[PDB]
Amino acid sequence: ETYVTGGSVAHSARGLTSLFSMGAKQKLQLVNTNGSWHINSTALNCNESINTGFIAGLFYYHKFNSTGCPQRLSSCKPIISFRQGWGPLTDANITGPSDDRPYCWHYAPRPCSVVPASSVCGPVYCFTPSPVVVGTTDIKGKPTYNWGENETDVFLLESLRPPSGRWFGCAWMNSTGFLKTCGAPPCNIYGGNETDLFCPTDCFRKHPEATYSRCGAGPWLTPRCMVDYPYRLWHYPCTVNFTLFKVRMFVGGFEHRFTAACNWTRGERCNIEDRDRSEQHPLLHSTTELAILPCSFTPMPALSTLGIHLHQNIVDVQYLYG
Amino acid sequence: ETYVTGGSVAHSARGLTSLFSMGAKQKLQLVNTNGSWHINSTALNCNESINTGFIAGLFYYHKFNSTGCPQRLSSCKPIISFRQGWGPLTDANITGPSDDRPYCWHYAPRPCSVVPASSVCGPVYCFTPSPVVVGTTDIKGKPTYNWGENETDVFLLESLRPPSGRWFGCAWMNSTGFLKTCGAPPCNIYGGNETDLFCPTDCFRKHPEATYSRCGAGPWLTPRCMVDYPYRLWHYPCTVNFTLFKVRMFVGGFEHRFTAACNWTRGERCNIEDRDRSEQHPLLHSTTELAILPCSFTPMPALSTLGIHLHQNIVDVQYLYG
Amino acid sequence: EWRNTSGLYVLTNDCSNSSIVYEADDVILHTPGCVPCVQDDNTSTCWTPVTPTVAVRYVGATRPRRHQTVQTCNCSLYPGHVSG
Amino acid sequence: EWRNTSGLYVLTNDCSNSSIVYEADDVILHTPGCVPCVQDDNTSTCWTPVTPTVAVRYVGATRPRRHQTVQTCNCSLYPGHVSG
Numbered sequence A, B: 001e002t003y004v005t006g007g008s009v010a011h012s013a014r015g016l017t018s019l020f021s022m023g024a025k026q027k028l029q030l031v032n033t034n035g036s037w038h039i040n041s042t043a044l045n046c047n048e049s050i051n052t053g054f055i056a057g058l059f060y061y062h063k064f065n066s067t068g069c070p071q072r073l074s075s076c077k078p079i080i081s082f083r084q085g086w087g088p089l090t091d092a093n094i095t096g097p098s099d100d101r102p103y104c105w106h107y108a109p110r111p112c113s114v115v116p117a118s119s120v121c122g123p124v125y126c127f128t129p130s131p132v133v134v135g136t137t138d139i140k141g142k143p144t145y146n147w148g149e150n151e152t153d154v155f156l157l158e159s160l161r162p163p164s165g166r167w168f169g170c171a172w173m174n175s176t177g178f179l180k181t182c183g184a185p186p187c188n189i190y191g192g193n194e195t196d197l198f199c200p201t202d203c204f205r206k207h208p209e210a211t212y213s214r215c216g217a218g219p220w221l222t223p224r225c226m227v228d229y230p231y232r233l234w235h236y237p238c239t240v241n242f243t244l245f246k247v248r249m250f251v252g253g254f255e256h257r258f259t260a261a262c263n264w265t266r267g268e269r270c271n272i273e274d275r276d277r278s279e280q281h282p283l284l285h286s287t288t289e290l291a292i293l294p295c296s297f298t299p300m301p302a303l304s305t306l307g308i309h310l311h312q313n314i315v316d317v318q319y320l321y322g
Numbered sequence C, D: 001e002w003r004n005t006s007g008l009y010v011l012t013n014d015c016s017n018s019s020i021v022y023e024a025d026d027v028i029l030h031t032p033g034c035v036p037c038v039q040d041d042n043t044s045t046c047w048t049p050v051t052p053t054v055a056v057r058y059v060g061a062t063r064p065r066r067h068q069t070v071q072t073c074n075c076s077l078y079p080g081h082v083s084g
């Protein structure tokens, strides 16, 4: 029986919190719109502060109406559905319309250009893999010079790869509540019935050296897991039932620590093929056990010998002292 | 008394090897040339194979004539002589003449462009931090079309930062035996009597986040240490008296292991200021002892607590279990 | 993680002004990555870290006060390692 | 470190053709990062590594032979971990 050990779940991270008793009044739920399913931007208070939003997100564990989530997720595809990859990595050039639904893990985003704040609700979050909130600055003073009309207080991202730039990718919701994200260009794995995956994340199984550092652009680390943040439910609704884990990145020489959620349920077949590469480093460094991402592994060989040692039934464990 | 523990030295890595008895006949020595000191390219056999060069370098431990080395090294400066740094990193643009002598640790190189093989003796090594040899390909077939005249089998590097590109920087000597190197653009630490250091390596003391991954470009990791390779003796003559250490890099998600030499002598003042950042990782991952570069440290906190623990008299050791 | 001296960045374990989140007259709270050091009058000393986020003066952990947040303080980078 | 199956890269501890530097009738030498696995006839078995660079069939380590360098091999990626 496949299960985890260190998997923390925030589904019932509450008790006797009935002071608000109803979603702190900004109830969130999905609504269809001409065959498209986005969040109900109408009620959906928008001008909250960081503390108010954090309080609002604390109460959001139970009242989320799981009705449109499956048919909305029908657009997303597993990593198997794509085709193989080979050759040296090349940076893709995303241009023109992008019909694909951005909430899928395998969505290739556009470069993170300037964006006015008149068409965004809630904070915008960039991912130097840990998440960071991004502020703004007035548009009248600088020569950006009125992208829209009499607008103000405009966001700007303009970041390269985090080893050189500032963040991998950023995400938010636009004024009508639809998810909007951008990031660094992803990797093309073919230039140098199925569809051609453009690898916005660590596509290890479909390409061997397409690591997150080289290819990752966005909150997705693996096709199964992602980096969590207070507005994760705010942006992506369907990831509510995920389970949390602690992650240590070590990106670009600097040290990064955060938490990650995963689309993991007990009993999933995870024999040998459903393992994805991800780069963790030990948090305690001792006890020879590593709480690594479920259905995954790390390129850190064992103490005495090499060869990744992983358990039959519990997948979050990485073994040392082989 | 300041000394090291794991420092391996190849000064006398020989015994009863008198079969050649004189440098395998390709004697190396430094000669002045109109006020410039380079290697005597005249005898200096050139068309050797890898095995022949490796055999040649094995015997090269004693006959090196320490005459021009100090006055040649007078051009180089310590990290203290430069000025402070601040602000976000920006990629410098090296153009025009470069009067500075390339063998100094703080030499900013040009981008690694194409280079014909008609003006290079010995192999050319790029540094994805571990060293790699670079091959060639004939100039006739490709439309690069005869940079010089009837020249053949040219070298091309054309690499970005190793997380995206292929290597940091590469080094060789040109036909007249003068050292020639190139690499990725370094960091400018001022744009965003002394001289402005352009940071071709991990200039931690002069700029806090100017790490090797972001800023380093070339074989130099620290102003004191460098990555060793079979032709280190060939390229840089004055580094004869260095001592070797084992290094684990873990760059760009992949794992890198190699050896490093350092300009270390017993008794150097190394109280607290002469420590340079260097992203190391454990080789044995046990015994709570880390074999780190002398007069340096790593950003890997301790097991139970944090705060880099280093010894008073032995600098190569990084302590755990604080 | 580092401090400024004579135009030369130098590693240290002293907390910066931005590395401390909350401080009381007997307890400091801070982001992991440093250790608090405090000077009162002609006397500066370290603060005992337990569960590195929070640090105590003496081991008596169990009203904010701005305790001078100073960094002319050496300890915890030379462990004075007792034989393990 | 990885092998090819049904158009899907999959992690393994089996050595590639390029990961082995020298092999003899009873000993293989290889770059660290994999483990040798050999098939002779309707029988593929695993090779015991000591000082991981060099691996031996059975523990009798102390004339090259091309021993089929196959990768239909599962061992060492589930340790079958004996209690420590």
Ligand SMILES: *[C@@H]1O[C@H](CO)[C@@H](O[C@@H]2O[C@H](CO)[C@@H](O[C@@H]3O[C@H](CO)[C@@H](O)[C@H](O)[C@@H]3O)[C@H](O)[C@H]2NC(C)=O)[C@H](O)[C@H]1NC(C)=O
Pocket: A066, A067, A069, A238, A239, A240, A241
């Ligand atoms: C996260 O896990 C919870 C717990 O299982 C899921 O809630 C459950 O979702 C199913 C699927 O819709 C519900 O079954 C349906 O319930 C409706 C209303 O009761 C009924 O009319 C249908 O015939 C069907 O039985 C189930 O009731 C519901 N249980 C609870 C306690 O909420 C949730 O869907 C999961 N969400 C995601 C995104 O995975």
Ligand SMILES: *[C@@H]1O[C@H](CO)[C@@H](O[C@@H]2O[C@H](CO)[C@@H](O[C@@H]3O[C@H](CO)[C@@H](O)[C@H](O)[C@@H]3O)[C@H](O)[C@H]2NC(C)=O)[C@H](O)[C@H]1NC(C)=O
Pocket: A070, A073, A074, A075, A076, A238, A239, A263
């Ligand atoms: C978490 O992982 C589960 C398991 O893969 C995801 O559920 C799967 O969702 C896909 C997408 O809709 C389903 O595929 C579709 O199935 C229908 C009906 O068979 C088919 O007509 C479509 O063509 C498409 O193949 C899949 O059946 C479903 N599997 C299970 C066991 O639920 C889930 O969506 C993932 N959630 C997140 C947030 O990642």
Ligand SMILES: *[C@@H]1O[C@H](CO)[C@@H](O[C@@H]2O[C@H](CO)[C@@H](O[C@@H]3O[C@H](CO)[C@@H](O)[C@H](O)[C@@H]3O)[C@H](O)[C@H]2NC(C)=O)[C@H](O)[C@H]1NC(C)=O
Pocket: A036, A119, A174, A175, A176, A177, A178, A179, A180
């Ligand atoms: C917030 O983001 C959503 C998601 O893209 C935006 O919805 C999209 O809005 C555009 C223009 O408003 C729509 O394009 C228009 O529709 C036709 C339909 O055929 C299209 O062919 C044309 O290009 C035409 O311009 C697009 O259909 C629509 N998509 C969805 C799924 O709703 C929304 O406008 C954004 N809101 C703001 C304030 O930026």
Ligand SMILES: *[C@@H]1O[C@H](CO)[C@@H](O[C@@H]2O[C@H](CO)[C@@H](O[C@@H]3O[C@H](CO)[C@@H](O)[C@H](O)[C@@H]3O)[C@H](O)[C@H]2NC(C)=O)[C@H](O)[C@H]1NC(C)=O
Pocket: B066, B067, B069, B238, B239, B240, B241
């Ligand atoms: C690496 O270490 C060796 C061992 O100490 C150094 O060799 C020594 O270098 C000194 C400095 O030139 C030599 O002293 C001079 O020797 C010449 C010729 O004997 C003499 O005419 C001078 O008056 C002066 O005494 C010393 O002899 C020499 N010893 C040996 C055994 O070679 C070497 O210089 C060091 N190299 C570097 C780059 O630091």
Ligand SMILES: *[C@@H]1O[C@H](CO)[C@@H](O[C@@H]2O[C@H](CO)[C@@H](O[C@@H]3O[C@H](CO)[C@@H](O)[C@H](O)[C@@H]3O)[C@H](O)[C@H]2NC(C)=O)[C@H](O)[C@H]1NC(C)=O
Pocket: B070, B073, B074, B075, B076, B238, B239, B263
């Ligand atoms: C290894 O480190 C030692 C110690 O710093 C280096 O020796 C030092 O080399 C510099 C450069 O020539 C010397 O500075 C010069 O000194 C002369 C005479 O005092 C002065 O006129 C110049 O203006 C310049 O300041 C320094 O004195 C010298 N110190 C010692 C103790 O030898 C050595 O070059 C380094 N070698 C390598 C390969 O890195």
Ligand SMILES: *[C@@H]1O[C@H](CO)[C@@H](O[C@@H]2O[C@H](CO)[C@@H](O[C@@H]3O[C@H](CO)[C@@H](O)[C@H](O)[C@@H]3O)[C@H](O)[C@H]2NC(C)=O)[C@H](O)[C@H]1NC(C)=O
Pocket: B036, B119, B174, B175, B176, B177, B178, B179
């Ligand atoms: C190998 O590399 C060395 C190091 O640069 C080359 O030496 C340099 O060669 C150039 C042209 O061959 C010399 O430039 C010429 O000299 C005057 C002197 O004022 C200069 O102002 C002009 O630009 C003129 O073109 C340069 O002075 C010389 N530098 C040194 C230190 O020797 C050498 O030519 C290279 N050999 C090959 C075969 O590539």
Ligand SMILES: *[C@@H]1O[C@H](CO)[C@@H](O[C@@H]2O[C@H](CO)[C@@H](O)[C@H](O)[C@H]2NC(C)=O)[C@H](O)[C@H]1NC(C)=O
Pocket: A026, A027, A028, A031, A040, A041, A042, A043, A044
């Ligand atoms: C979800 O969206 C619907 C619109 O499709 C919102 O319904 C309207 O809400 C306003 C604001 O209270 C009312 O004045 C209207 O009478 C509602 N119309 C209908 C048909 O219900 C609904 O409020 C949204 N839910 C929120 C914001 O929580």
Ligand SMILES: *[C@@H]1O[C@H](CO)[C@@H](O[C@@H]2O[C@H](CO)[C@@H](O)[C@H](O)[C@H]2NC(C)=O)[C@H](O)[C@H]1NC(C)=O
Pocket: A065, A066, A067
């Ligand atoms: C979740 O949202 C769905 C939206 O379709 C709700 O389903 C509708 O419920 C209303 C009244 O409750 C009725 O018009 C129909 O039963 C549904 N309309 C459809 C399917 O078009 C569902 O009731 C909501 N559930 C919760 C618990 O909020």
Ligand SMILES: *[C@@H]1O[C@H](CO)[C@@H](O[C@@H]2O[C@H](CO)[C@@H](O)[C@H](O)[C@H]2NC(C)=O)[C@H](O)[C@H]1NC(C)=O
Pocket: B065, B066, B067
């Ligand atoms: C090292 O090189 C120097 C180069 O100057 C040699 O010094 C020369 O030695 C020859 C004879 O040995 C003299 O005729 C020259 O006058 C010397 N040069 C100068 C500038 O005085 C030195 O002999 C060499 N030593 C070794 C051991 O090779």
Ligand SMILES: *[C@@H]1O[C@H](CO)[C@@H](O[C@@H]2O[C@H](CO)[C@@H](O)[C@H](O)[C@H]2NC(C)=O)[C@H](O)[C@H]1NC(C)=O
Pocket: B271, B272, B273, C005, C072, C073, C074
């Ligand atoms: C350790 O503490 C000393 C004093 O407690 C600090 O300052 C050093 O003091 C010594 C004694 O005179 C001087 O020689 C050093 O130059 C001082 N350091 C500096 C950077 O100026 C300092 O906090 C620690 N020592 C050092 C060398 O940093």
Ligand SMILES: *[C@@H]1O[C@H](CO)[C@@H](O[C@@H]2O[C@H](CO)[C@@H](O)[C@H](O)[C@H]2NC(C)=O)[C@H](O)[C@H]1NC(C)=O
Pocket: A271, A272, A273, D005, D072, D073, D074
């Ligand atoms: C472990 O070894 C098996 C056989 O020893 C290899 O192939 C798998 O064999 C099982 C048994 O029928 C099949 O169900 C799997 O589909 C086979 N794997 C594949 C990829 O086809 C294989 O080396 C290992 N098992 C797996 C699942 O990879």
